[PDB]
Design a protein around this ligand. Structure first.
Ligand SMILES: *[C@@H]1O[C@H](CO[C@@H]2O[C@@H](C)[C@@H](O)[C@@H](O)[C@@H]2O)[C@@H](O[C@@H]2O[C@H](CO)[C@@H](O[C@@H]3O[C@H](CO)[C@@H](O)[C@H](O)[C@@H]3O)[C@H](O)[C@H]2NC(C)=O)[C@H](O)[C@H]1NC(C)=O
Ligand SMILES: *[C@@H]1O[C@H](CO[C@@H]2O[C@@H](C)[C@@H](O)[C@@H](O)[C@@H]2O)[C@@H](O[C@@H]2O[C@H](CO)[C@@H](O)[C@H](O)[C@H]2NC(C)=O)[C@H](O)[C@H]1NC(C)=O
Ligand SMILES: *[C@@H]1O[C@H](CO)[C@@H](O[C@@H]2O[C@H](CO)[C@@H](O)[C@H](O)[C@H]2NC(C)=O)[C@H](O)[C@H]1NC(C)=O
Ligand SMILES: *[C@@H]1O[C@H](CO)[C@@H](O[C@@H]2O[C@H](CO)[C@@H](O)[C@H](O)[C@H]2NC(C)=O)[C@H](O)[C@H]1NC(C)=O
Ligand SMILES: *[C@@H]1O[C@H](CO)[C@@H](O[C@@H]2O[C@H](CO)[C@@H](O)[C@H](O)[C@H]2NC(C)=O)[C@H](O)[C@H]1NC(C)=O
Ligand SMILES: *[C@@H]1O[C@H](CO)[C@@H](O[C@@H]2O[C@H](CO)[C@@H](O)[C@H](O)[C@H]2NC(C)=O)[C@H](O)[C@H]1NC(C)=O
Ligand SMILES: *[C@@H]1O[C@H](CO)[C@@H](O[C@@H]2O[C@H](CO)[C@@H](O)[C@H](O)[C@H]2NC(C)=O)[C@H](O)[C@H]1NC(C)=O
Ligand SMILES: *[C@@H]1O[C@H](CO)[C@@H](O[C@@H]2O[C@H](CO)[C@@H](O)[C@H](O)[C@H]2NC(C)=O)[C@H](O)[C@H]1NC(C)=O
Ligand SMILES: *[C@@H]1O[C@H](CO)[C@@H](O[C@@H]2O[C@H](CO)[C@@H](O)[C@H](O)[C@H]2NC(C)=O)[C@H](O)[C@H]1NC(C)=O
Ligand SMILES: *[C@@H]1O[C@H](CO)[C@@H](O[C@@H]2O[C@H](CO)[C@@H](O)[C@H](O)[C@H]2NC(C)=O)[C@H](O)[C@H]1NC(C)=O
Ligand SMILES: *[C@@H]1O[C@H](CO)[C@@H](O[C@@H]2O[C@H](CO)[C@@H](O)[C@H](O)[C@H]2NC(C)=O)[C@H](O)[C@H]1NC(C)=O
Ligand code: NAG
Ligand code: NAG
Lengths: 382, 281, 294, 49, 49, 49, 49, 49, 49
């Protein structure tokens, strides 16, 4: 505490007085990792080794649940030229759980890959497939030029060229109502100013790169605000109560002291929030117990200092510690804890201002110097 | 096999105010929006309850006490307890609580509930207990020293497997377990209610009625009974089987039933919400 | 204020980034310290005016006058007068003369208890240097001083003066002849004794007069509660919670989000300190007048 | 006319809103006359008028 | 909204005769249906007796 | 149990896909199809005697 | 708002909101300082009255 | 000060973004109100003696 | 200053994994740049070498 005062004041010398210091803090000693009881691996094969992809015209949406998102399983044989995540840094994927997870699946032309991103325009972005402005997922794409290609052209892949308006995010429209143009009434018949709304792709194996077919997978998911049925490969540990710990609960990290709670979460609520929107309770993913999370740091400390040009001894006042040696129960497993002080010395004095450690106490009274508080002062004497 | 615990500090009994506790539903009848007059053996209102304060593990000059005395049954027993860690686990009901006659043993042990009526050779200082710690943090239960032997067993009942929470806790009491035990015309009738609490020192003031729970067809003479508590043992408290133990975080109360008449108040859903002890004043 | 805890409570990455806004965190602390020093000086200037602490005389024969509800009641554990107990009982403080222990917040209660919630966000309250008992001793001394010597208890050695004479001189001061006091001594004493009882009864009945004191207390409480509520603001960030930022983002992205929250939290603290300084100037002015009037 | 688990009588059976506890088969009115029953095959509560 | 048809709900006992009861409650999330369609109008389906 | 379902969509006709939600006897079915809807759709219960 | 899509516009809007709030905070602070001075003047004037 | 109008006068997108630091906008007005109240008291102390 | 050049051959789809902050078998197991990388990256298609 004296050095802390010296650092604060940018000085090697501290004048006699009272200085405030940082709150008393303790460090966490172990980490608790908890994930839901998921035993299965996610259907990476079905998603990336599919016999067929939908045309962009009428894209598919697969729901994903009760599995491990171990993305590394694709490292042995998949190769993706295109990759971009929007709602999360990709380096964090293995420490997170994912929820409300869906995989959109379709085929587009290579020059159209750039139109998938949110905020883009063009015939695909406007008429076939669109992501929202605030998309929170990640996009994967690759050059399937030996799967989706045919010598005479692959005409099983279709896209919409005409619509009277643009699509909203995640919409599909499979209507074949003939497109009318030029205020020229049309009774469903292709002709002047009347078009079938759909067109096919070529995708011959002999075309240049911009014309090769590409497979696009869009992973749409949410993080940290709901129970998850899909999670990364990180292994869990046992949970320790009434200790200062580090933790990871379904991707939500932090530190603090976990205590049992009496809060009653609804069946769909995984996490709670306090009055200033900070998580203060969680529902454990393996057993649905509710635990309150209390910060490790607390209280306050101040230091009673004689001039440092006289003595390097100081006395320390603890704002949240009584120091009265009240008899307590013996926990069977735990040993009775100590006072939240940096050190307990030879002189412990208890007052209304908090307990003071290191100053001798006398029953005398005098003129105030180096005021401590609540009727108490101190001085340096032989 | 059993052992006498020899480290207990000798402390006096405490007494408390029963207030309005010990009320139960008089029959299996749906009634509502009505006041009803009945007669039965009930804990009298504002009665003298013996307080078996039993958490004395604290202090340098330790007061460790594991209080499991034999108490009279009289006309029926009001029993209640407050606990935070599943310590109060059972009862022995009988004549002399000895091998000479049949008696009733009810124990909630880890993973099951067993009720037997046998000629048990009971321990003078019976107990249950949990010991394992250190290699892993799970607590594990292994001690059962209630009786050394038993024979001529009848009414053997075993419940279904379950898991039990053994870990000791700090903080307030969480579980109020209120019971009424009666022995009438061949049946041992037990009524009960489990209510959440957050108290620190004594039986909470308040009112509820207990539900019928069970009727056990056991034709025995119950004159006295004994409360069965579990011990906390660990690496932290060395000693042999008579000394290497601590008291856990639980305590209990005993009152007695007397014939009384009551006015019971049934609300619109048939819940008893209040009562008048007609002999109180 | 623990200016680190308010911003980066229990957060390593935030804590290191926050080191850059260094002398500023310290500057806020200096300003609050200066206020705290003045609050004790103000108390001392108003009450600790005379170092001679006089005991209430054993003689209560201050002419026909009573004064017992003004003077300290020796039968109480307190050193307060009857009127003072009413003043103290009517103003509501969140608490007084008590320290909350860390373990007291290890429960659900931490989220309901504003004192606990403020402490966990680095906001603390410092105890006064002078206690109620010491103040009671100062008012006791002043009362013993003025009941016996009156004007002369100050500006020199105290001189005892008969109470009737003290008032005769006070009347001469106003310009009322001394003859009135002696001729009407019983009337004056009866009017006074009645008036004091009326004040005491008025105080027992209506506490609204104390609203000024209640407001000082409420205003500081509100300012601290505001600092806690303001923690929820995003300030351009994705989320106001450091843990959400740290969980989803890598360092270089987390840093942007963290800087946005640090700036916002700093604005909240700077605003707080400024308001406390303005309020401090106003309380000093009141205290200076109070000291002057004493 | 009726017989509910041996309890006989006559009257008009209407659906009720009374909530019997799991162990209560029959109820009683203010003058101890059965005025509601729990049906033995489906646990519906019927008032008897 | 944005590809989802969100439905919230609550089931509450009533004993009213003529109109929507006055009172307050909040509905729970129930379900999120991932259906990418344009809903502009709707029709209520009733059964006949 | 009369109010059993809803139709949500564009024109509520066969030209485009729309959402049909129905609580029918014994089950709940949700489908999104190019339905050719009835102008006066209904469900119903008949058998008696 | 005209030239930018929402997520880009949000950056630009946040800069202006922060800016405007800082301007208002400055205003309020100055008014509070001036208010202290006017009170002092008023108190002196009241004393002289 | 209408602290919303000053920032997002007649602008919906801005207004919604402005709701996040909402307590602040309120506090600015509270401070101004305190000044405003004191101004009438100052007048009363000086003249209404 | 303190200038070094790292050099290697990878598959073309993996070029994108070189940038700091990326993941993938190269970014995770073969070669990685730091979060605060202060340098510059160059790459080309040596398809005839
Ligand atoms: C917060 O919740 C507690 C506990 O209630 C239980 O948990 C909730 C989350 C819900 O799921 C509840 O449906 C569930 O019961 C509430 O405490 C309880 O309140 C009820 C009254 O609503 C109390 O009932 C009384 O019981 C006495 C004795 O029988 C009667 O005389 C009274 O007339 C009345 O029926 C009940 O005892 C009480 N529980 C405990 C342990 O004290 C709490 O009120 C609720 N808070 C709020 C703001 O709603
Ligand atoms: C500091 O400790 C004293 C000592 O009392 C004991 O420890 C307290 C924390 C509390 O647990 C007491 O019950 C213990 O006896 C406290 O003084 C006590 O104050 C309480 C409340 O008024 C009173 O019930 C006790 O009898 C007092 N005990 C004695 C012997 O003085 C004091 O309040 C504590 N200060 C704090 C926590 O701020
Ligand atoms: C996707 O399909 C490829 C095959 O095209 C799978 O890769 C093969 O995996 C087996 C082991 O099961 C190896 O023996 C083969 O040598 C691999 N083939 C190639 C070309 O590398 C791949 O595992 C499948 N991916 C998923 C997620 O199911
Ligand atoms: C959702 O359906 C509505 C109603 O059909 C569409 O709005 C109409 O669009 C046609 C052109 O296709 C116009 O001629 C009408 O005047 C519009 N009506 C109204 C009330 O605006 C709307 O465009 C559809 N949305 C999407 C994304 O397709
Ligand atoms: C606890 O101590 C009591 C004595 O205070 C023991 O009681 C005696 O036990 C012996 C057998 O060892 C009998 O022969 C005596 O007749 C008993 N005396 C009485 C008065 O009962 C008791 O057995 C001890 N229990 C344990 C578990 O050690
Ligand atoms: C709790 O009591 C049960 C029931 O008495 C114990 O389980 C029995 O163990 C015996 C061993 O001889 C078996 O023959 C029974 O079939 C078991 N019963 C059941 C229902 O499984 C159980 O071991 C006791 N708990 C502890 C911790 O010892
Ligand atoms: C925790 O560790 C204890 C100690 O090794 C395990 O309990 C032992 O189990 C063996 C049988 O495998 C018994 O022979 C020992 O007597 C037991 N120990 C004690 C002190 O009684 C316990 O099973 C482990 N628990 C978990 C969850 O791993
Ligand atoms: C209760 O158990 C005892 C055993 O402790 C029974 O005693 C029997 O006594 C006869 C005497 O002729 C012996 O031949 C038997 O072998 C004994 N039985 C056993 C199991 O040892 C006694 O009969 C039993 N009483 C009842 C009612 O069951
Ligand atoms: C001052 O007035 C008080 C009353 O306000 C007088 O004391 C009371 O004396 C009666 C005697 O019957 C007691 O019942 C009251 O309890 C006393 N009250 C208090 C507050 O002490 C007191 O004697 C008067 N003193 C002088 C000097 O006139
Ligand atoms: C001045 O007025 C007071 C009343 O305000 C007079 O005192 C009261 O006289 C009545 C006469 O009936 C008594 O009952 C009251 O007890 C008296 N009050 C007090 C406090 O003594 C007083 O006499 C008048 N004085 C002069 C000079 O006219
Ligand atoms: C209520 O709807 C269900 C579901 O559509 C009907 O049951 C289905 O009947 C078809 C007949 O072709 C079967 O192929 C399906 O397998 C059945 N589904 C299920 C879940 O059983 C049911 O018949 C309808 N109710 C009525 C009264 O007609
Ligand atoms: C799921 O529970 C079983 C016990 O039934 C346990 O053995 C397994 O390790 C748990 N699961 C996971 C996915 O970690
Ligand atoms: C119960 O009776 C005993 C008799 O020794 C007495 O000391 C105690 O105070 C009584 N307690 C109550 C609560 O009435």
């Amino acid at each position: 505490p004296l050095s802390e005062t010296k650092c604060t004041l940018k000085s090697f010398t501290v004048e006699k007085g009272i200085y405030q210091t940082s709150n008393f803090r303790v460090q966490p000693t172990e980490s608790i990792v908890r994930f839901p009881n998921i035993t299965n691996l996610c259907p990476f094969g079905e998603v990336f080794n599919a016999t067929r992809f939908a045309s962009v015209y009428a894209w598919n949406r697969k729901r994903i649940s009760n599995c491990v998102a171990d993305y590394s399983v694709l490292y042995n044989s998949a190769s993706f030229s295109t990759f971009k995540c929007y709602g999360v840094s990709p380096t964090k994927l293995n420490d997170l759980c994912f929820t409300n997870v869906y995989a959109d699946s379709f085929v587009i032309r290579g020059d159209e890959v750039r139109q998938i991103a949110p905020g883009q325009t063009g015939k695909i972005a406007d008429y076939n497939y669109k992501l929202p402005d605030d998309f929170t997922g990640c996009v994967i794409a690759w050059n399937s030029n030996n799967l989706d290609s045919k010598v005479g052209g692959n005409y099983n892949y279709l896209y919409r060229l005409f619509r009277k308006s643009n699509l909203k995010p995640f919409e599909r429209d499979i209507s074949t109502e003939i497109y009318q143009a030029g205020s020229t009434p049309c009774n469903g018949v292709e002709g002047f100013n009347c078009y079938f709304p759909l067109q096919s792709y070529g995708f011959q194996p002999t075309n240049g790169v911009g014309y090769q077919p590409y497979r696009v997978v869009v992973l749409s998911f949410e993080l940290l605000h709901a129970p998850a049925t899909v999670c990364g490969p990180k292994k869990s540990t046992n949970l320790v109560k009434n200790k200062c710990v580090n933790f990871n609960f379904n991707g939500l990290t932090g530190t603090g002291v976990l205590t049992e709670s009496n809060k009653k979460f609804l069946p769909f609520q995984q996490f709670g929030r306090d009055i200033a929107d900070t998580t203060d309770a969680v529902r454990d993913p393996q057993t649905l117990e509710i635990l309150d999370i209390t910060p490790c740091s607390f209280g306050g400390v101040s230091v009673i200092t004689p001039g440092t040009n006289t003595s390097n001894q100081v006395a320390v006042l603890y704002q949240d510690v009584n120091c009265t040696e009240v008899p307590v129960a013996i926990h069977a497993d735990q040993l009775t804890p100590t006072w939240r002080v940096y050190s307990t010395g030879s002189n412990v004095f208890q007052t209304r201002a908090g307990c003071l450690i290191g100053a001798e106490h006398v029953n005398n009274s005098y003129e105030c110097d180096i005021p401590i508080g609540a009727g108490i002062c101190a001085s340096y004497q032989t | 096999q059993c052992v006498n615990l020899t480290t207990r500090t000798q402390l006096p009994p405490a007494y408390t105010n029963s207030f309005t506790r010990g009320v139960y539903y008089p029959d299996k009848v749906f009634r509502s929006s009505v006041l009803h007059s009945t007669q039965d053996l009930f804990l009298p209102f504002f009665s003298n309850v013996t307080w078996f304060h039993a958490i004395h593990v604290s202090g340098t000059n330790g007061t460790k006490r594991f209080d499991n005395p034999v108490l009279p049954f009289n006309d029926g027993v009001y029993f209640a307890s407050t606990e935070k860690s599943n310590i109060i686990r059972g009862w022995i009901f009988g004549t002399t609580l000895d091998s000479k006659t049949q008696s009733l043993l009810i124990v909630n042990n880890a993973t099951n509930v067993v009720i037997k009526v046998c000629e048990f050779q009971f321990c003078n200082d019976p107990f249950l207990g949990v010991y394992y710690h250190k290699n892993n943090k799970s607590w594990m239960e292994s001690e059962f020293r209630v009786y050394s032997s038993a024979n001529n067993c009848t009414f053997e009942y075993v419940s279904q497997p379950f898991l039990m929470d053994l870990e000791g806790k700090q903080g307030n009491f969480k579980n109020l377990r209120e019971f009424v035990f009666k022995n009438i015309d061949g049946y041992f009738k037990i009524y009960s209610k489990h209510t959440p609490i957050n108290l620190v020192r004594d039986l909470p003031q308040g009112f509820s009625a207990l539900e019928p729970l069970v009727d056990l067809p056991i034709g025995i003479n119950i004159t006295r009974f004994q409360t069965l508590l579990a011990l906390h043992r660990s690496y932290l408290t060395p000693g042999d089987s008579s000394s290497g133990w601590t008291a856990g975080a639980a305590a209990y109360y005993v009152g007695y039933l007397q014939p009384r008449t009551f006015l019971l108040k049934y609300n619109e859903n048939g819940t008893i919400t209040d009562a008048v002890d007609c002999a109180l004043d | 204020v623990d200016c680190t805890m308010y911003i980066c409570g229990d957060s390593t990455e935030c804590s290191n980034l926050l080191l850059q806004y260094g002398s500023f965190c310290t500057q806020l602390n200096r300003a609050l310290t200066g206020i705290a020093v003045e609050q004790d000086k103000n108390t001392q200037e108003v009450f600790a005016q005379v170092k001679q602490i006089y005991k209430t005389p054993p003689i209560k024969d201050f002419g026909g006058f009573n004064f017992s509800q003004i003077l300290p009641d020796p039968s109480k554990p307190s050193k307060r007068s009857f009127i003072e107990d009413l003043l103290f009982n009517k103003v509501t403080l969140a608490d007084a003369g008590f320290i909350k222990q860390y373990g007291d917040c290890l429960g659900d209660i931490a989220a309901r208890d504003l004192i606990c919630a403020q402490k966990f966000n680095g906001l603390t309250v410092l105890p006064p240097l002078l206690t109620d008992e010491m103040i009671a001793q100062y008012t006791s001394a002043l009362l013993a001083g003025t009941i016996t010597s009156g004007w002369t208890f100050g500006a020199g050695a105290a001189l005892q003066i008969p109470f009737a004479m003290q008032m005769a001189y006070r009347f001469n001061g106003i310009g009322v002849t001394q003859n009135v006091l002696y001729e009407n001594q019983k009337l004056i004493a009866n009017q006074f004794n009645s008036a004091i009882g009326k004040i005491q009864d008025s105080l027992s009945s209506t506490a609204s007069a104390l609203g000024k004191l209640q407001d000082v207390v409420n205003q500081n409480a509100q300012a601290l509660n505001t600092l806690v509520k303001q923690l929820s603001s995003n300030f351009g960030a994705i989320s106001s919670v450091l843990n959400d930022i740290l969980s989803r983002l890598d360092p270089p992205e987390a840093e942007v989000q963290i800087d946005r929250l640090i700036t916002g939290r700093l604005q909240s603290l700077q605003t707080y300190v400024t308001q406390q300084l303005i309020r401090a100037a106003e309380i000093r002015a009141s205290a200076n007048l109070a000291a002057t009037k004493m």
